[PDB]
Amino acid sequence: VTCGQVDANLAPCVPFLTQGGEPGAACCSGVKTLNGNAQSPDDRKTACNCIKAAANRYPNLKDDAAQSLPSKCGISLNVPISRTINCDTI
């Protein structure tokens, strides 16, 4: 819904998103929280663009790092996590 919740839930992933390894229970909990509260197509689009905004705030990260997040947390997302993602394909 709002990008503040996106950032708050993704905060515990910055250690994983900068240092790799296995994401802790906090980061996985945040990813699942974000996924659960983005239900309608407009919800998922808003969240996708909040994610792009955060990615531009952290523009020195690797996108292949964040793509391993859903598989390592359980979820199968509907978009590639890449800084170039066209969120309109949702």
Ligand X SMILES: CCCCCCCCCCCCCC(=O)O
Binding site for ligand X (CB under 6 A): 7, 10-11, 14, 17, 51, 54-55, 58, 61, 63, 66, 81, 83
d(CA 90, CA 58): 23
16 residue type, one letter: F
Q: How far is the CB of 61 from ligand X (least distance, A)?
A: 4
Identity of the residue, 27 or 74, whose beta carbon is nearer to ligand X in the bound complex: 27
Please, what is the Cα angle at 86 between 16 and 32, to 5 degrees?
40
Q: How far is the CB of 85 from ligand X (least distance, A)?
A: 8
Measured in whole angstroms, the distance separating CA 51 from the mean position of its chain's CA atoms is 6
Q: How far is the CB of 21 from ligand X (least distance, A)?
A: 16
Q: Residue 41 in contact with residue 31, Cβ under 8 Å?
A: no
d(CA 65, CA 67): 5
